[PDB]
């Protein structure tokens, strides 16, 4: 897409904040100044974090942008980014962007940051198998199936999501830095073959068991597994319970809505040293 004749900035970039960003990038004096296509072709980087941008309409006319910093705006749609064929680095933290499929043709994209966007569905990222860095912290993701295709990732953050099933990571042996804190992970076996890890974070899991019936003498199998499948010993057990491997046991003369236990296990994978820590909650049916 091109502007055939020089046109005022504010006619191309409908968002007042983004028009000012373009003006400043080009060292123009006002958003009413005319811009040429050649001037737009010369934009290779935009830094516009925390700028109150609600839309990047008009950015489609910037074919050569390689780095886009748009953290902390009010974006809800990234359709105008879809044909930015040279984009290599994209930062979109703290927006509300969910149309990840809009990125599918960005085949030079190496780094993508989408933290705190309210994302659940990441299936559109399947179209970016060349990605080297992916940051999806602080979202509401449960299903990371498609990440089994992202075999060029060396850095991946999924911290602070709702993930229990990390099997899709098992084959991603290029991973070096892997951030998985604050999920629902109880089973590390998917990580066992990640021999190139240097950084691994496994803090503060919440592992939620399927409800079972309350009984006065409760017996709950421990399902927390290390990378070799061995059971991780609980360190702290609620309600005066005790561990008799492989079961946690409680005497509950009165109904209570849940019992729980907490575990902590140092783990080494590759060169990475991690602390796998979590709470298992067992809800009880009265």
């Amino acid at each position, epitope marked *: 897409e091109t502007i055939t004749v020089p046109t005022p900035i504010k006619q191309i970039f409908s968002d007042d904040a983004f028009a000012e960003t373009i003006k400043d990038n080009l060292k123009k004096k006002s958003v009413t100044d005319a811009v040429t296509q050649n001037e737009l072709n010369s934009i290779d980087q935009i830094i516009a974090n925390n700028s109150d941008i609600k839309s990047v309409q008009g950015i489609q006319y910037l074919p050569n942008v390689t*780095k886009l910093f748009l953290n902390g705006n009010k974006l809800t749609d990234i359709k105008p980014l879809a044909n930015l064929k040279n984009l290599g680095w994209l930062f979109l933290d703290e927006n509300k962007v969910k149309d990840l499929s809009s990125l599918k043709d960005l085949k030079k994209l190496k780094s993508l940051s989408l933290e705190h966007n309210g994302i659940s569905d990441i299936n559109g990222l399947v179209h970016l198998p060349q990605l080297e*860095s992916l940051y999806l912290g602080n979202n509401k993701i449960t299903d990371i199936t498609v990440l089994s295709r992202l075999t060029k990732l*060396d*850095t991946l*953050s999924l911290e602070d999501n709702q993930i229990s099933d990390i099997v899709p990571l098992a084959g991603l042996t290029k991973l070096q*830095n892997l951030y998985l804190s604050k999920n629902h992970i109880s089973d590390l076996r998917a990580l066992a073959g990640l021999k190139n890890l*240097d950084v691994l*974070e496994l803090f503060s899991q919440e592992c939620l068991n399927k409800p079972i019936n309350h009984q006065s003498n409760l017996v709950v199998p421990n399902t927390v597994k290390n990378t070799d499948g061995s059971l991780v010993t609980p360190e702290i057990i609620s309600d005066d319970g005790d561990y008799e491997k492989p079961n946690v046991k409680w005497h509950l003369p009165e109904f209570t809505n849940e019992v729980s236990f907490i575990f902590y296990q140092p783990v080494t994978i590759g060169k990475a040293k991690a602390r796998f820590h979590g709470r298992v909650t067992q809800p009880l049916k009265e």
Partner: nanobody, 122 residues
Framework: VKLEESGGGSVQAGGSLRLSCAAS????????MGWFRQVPGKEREGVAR????????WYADSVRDRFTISQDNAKNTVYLQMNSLKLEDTAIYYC????????????????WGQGTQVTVSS
């Protein structure tokens, strides 16, 4: 996040200097820390980094065999040993940090220290 810089100074070409940088306040469990350098007016450039809490390092092509970066993870401090210093190494060296090393390399999103003068003379 606050970065405290130490070291630097002036030394004759071929000599050695050391730089230190300590991170304090609200540090992540692991993070990227190291230095960029800049001659006044000229473009800043990455020098060396290390993943504090891991082990991976990176060096600019021009320093790769003369400089060594290390960490004291317990002190949240990194160290740069600068050997065989050249006139071209004269610059202000800025400690700088980002949670993720691949982003650290860009500079743009980093936390920055105030800068330490390094001067190499003939």
């Amino acid at each position: 996040v606050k970065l405290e810089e130490s070291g630097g100074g002036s030394v004759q070409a071929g000599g050695s200097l050391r730089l230190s940088c300590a991170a304090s306040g609200h540090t992540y469990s692991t993070y990227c820390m190291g230095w960029f350098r800049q001659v006044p007016g000229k473009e800043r450039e990455g020098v060396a980094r290390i993943n504090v809490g891991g082990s991976s390092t990176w060096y600019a092509d021009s320093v790769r065999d003369r400089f060594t970066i290390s960490q004291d993870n317990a002190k949240n401090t990194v160290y740069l040993q600068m050997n065989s210093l050249k006139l071209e190494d004269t610059a202000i060296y800025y400690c700088t940090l980002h949670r993720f090393c691949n982003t650290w390399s860009l500079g743009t999103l980093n936390v920055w220290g105030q800068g330490t003068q390094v001067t190499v003379s003939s």
